[PDB]
Amino acid sequence: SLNITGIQSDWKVEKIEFAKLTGERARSAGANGRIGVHGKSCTVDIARITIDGQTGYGSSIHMTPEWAEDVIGRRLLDLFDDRGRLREAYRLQLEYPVLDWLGQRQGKPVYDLVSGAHLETGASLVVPCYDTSLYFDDLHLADERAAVALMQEEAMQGYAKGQRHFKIKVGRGGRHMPLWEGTKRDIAIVRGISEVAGPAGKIMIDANNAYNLNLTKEVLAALSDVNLYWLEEAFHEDEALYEDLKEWLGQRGQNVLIADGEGLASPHLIEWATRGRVDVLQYDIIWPGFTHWMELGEKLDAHGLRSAPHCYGNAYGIYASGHLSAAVRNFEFVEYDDITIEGMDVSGYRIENGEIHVPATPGFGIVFDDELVTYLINRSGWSEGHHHHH
Numbered sequence: 001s002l003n004i005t006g007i008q009s010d011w012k013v014e015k016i017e018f019a020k021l022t023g024e025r026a027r028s029a030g031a032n033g034r035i036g037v038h039g040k041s042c043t044v045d046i047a048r049i050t051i052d053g054q055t056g057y058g059s060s061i062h063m064t065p066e067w068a069e070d071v072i073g074r075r076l077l078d079l080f081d082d083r084g085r086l087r088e089a090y091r092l093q094l095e096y097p098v099l100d101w102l103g104q105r106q107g108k109p110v111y112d113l114v115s116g117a118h119l120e121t122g123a124s125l126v127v128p129c130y131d132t133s134l135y136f137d138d139l140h141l142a143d144e145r146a147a148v149a150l151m152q153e154e155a156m157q158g159y160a161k162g163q164r165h166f167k168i169k170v171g172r173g174g175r176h177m178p179l180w181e182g183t184k185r186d187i188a189i190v191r192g193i194s195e196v197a198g199p200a201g202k203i204m205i206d207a208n209n210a211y212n213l214n215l216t217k218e219v220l221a222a223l224s225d226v227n228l229y230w231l232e233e234a235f236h237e238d239e240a241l242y243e244d245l246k247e248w249l250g251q252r253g254q255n256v257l258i259a260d261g262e263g264l265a266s267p268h269l270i271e272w273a274t275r276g277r278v279d280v281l282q283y284d285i286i287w288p289g290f291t292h293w294m295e296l297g298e299k300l301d302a303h304g305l306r307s308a309p310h311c312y313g314n315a316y317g318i319y320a321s322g323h324l325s326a327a328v329r330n331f332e333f334v335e336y337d338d339i340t341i342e343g344m345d346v347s348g349y350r351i352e353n354g355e356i357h358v359p360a361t362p363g364f365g366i367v368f369d370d371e372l373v374t375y376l377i378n379r380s381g382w383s384e385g386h387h388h389h390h
């Protein structure tokens with residue numbers, strides 16, 4: 001919900017411009033339990049919106065020139081319902097540029113504009129984050145010791161940049177290595193990173209569905225001494241298997257959360273979570289997006305459930321996730337990948353002690369290079385403009 005009382009009926013969408021920004025991860029990402037090398041190259045589709053002679057910038061997906069043509073001339077007020085929530089039809093395309101615009105216009109950070117009761121006025125926003133970049137980077141190595149040292153040094157690269165919590169890909173034995181050896185390698189890797197991370201470092205493991213229940217129990221038992229904070233997508237979500245898993249964990253006093261929800265999720269996943277089978281929901285920060293997450297976060301909060309938006313493959317979402325924490329009480333972590341996108345200055349954000357310090361600057365606090373984005377729009381993007389209707 002957004003305070004819309006300051007939005008004049010005068011204010012209309014005057015222009016929508018679109019461009020793909022390009023860049024690179026700090027370290028090339030290898031395989032995961034289900035698919036191959038993710039690589040080093042990164043892109044972010046951005047829209048620059050002009051309303052009342054002022055621009056906002058943000059992630060935009062599922063928007064064609066034709067789609068934007070129909071929106072030119074609409075009143076900003078008409079894009080919201082009276083609750084202050086951007087209408088469904090505009091979310092994936094325009095929520096981010098619009099929220100960025102409102103922030104620049106009101107001179108406030110988005111988190112301030114969507115702040116829930118759990119977050120009081122004037123306060124610095126500091127959000128937990130974890131390093132998500134620990135992919136299967138060891139598949140060229142035969143020697144388990146060598147694989148562990150490689151993965152440890154990778155974790156160390158993040159540690160030196162202020163990461164304290166690490167999500168480690170596992171499920172090597174599902175597709176990419178023989179099952180027995182792959183699972184042994186998974187365990188050695190996780191034990192190795194936990195050592196580098198220290199006792200206070202939270203460790204998450206993500207199998208990308210490569211396990212079954214008995215493999216999951218074997219791996220958890222081997223990691224009973226590890227500060228394992230959550231297990232994510234051990235196998236495609238299933239209420240019976242997750243009930244058994246939770247009972248098994250309880251009897252052993254092993255305090256590991258169950259996380260799921262990315263990709264093609266079960267339509268019943270939220271029901272299953274309310275029954276205590278899944279603890280952390282992980283729908284993506286871009287699709288279904290920020291506005292949807294505000295609505296979903298409220299609901300999950302009411303049930304004592306936890307929110308951890310998936311972010312991978314879109315650098316912009318990392319910064320978006322930060323702001324969302326102000327609106328959702330049981331926000332867990334920003335999923336962090338070290339990415340440099342040309343023309344997208346994220347300098348205002350700093351990583352310290354396993355947390356991302358969100359700047360108090362207008363909008364999403366990301367400073368876009370107006371000159372470069374104009375060049376990109378002209379060269380490889382598009383513009384739609386004019387005035388109102390129809």
Ligand SMILES: [Mg+2]
Binds near residue numbers: 206208
């Ligand atoms: Mg995952």
Ligand SMILES: [Mg+2]
Binds near residue numbers: 233236237261262265
């Ligand atoms: Mg799943």
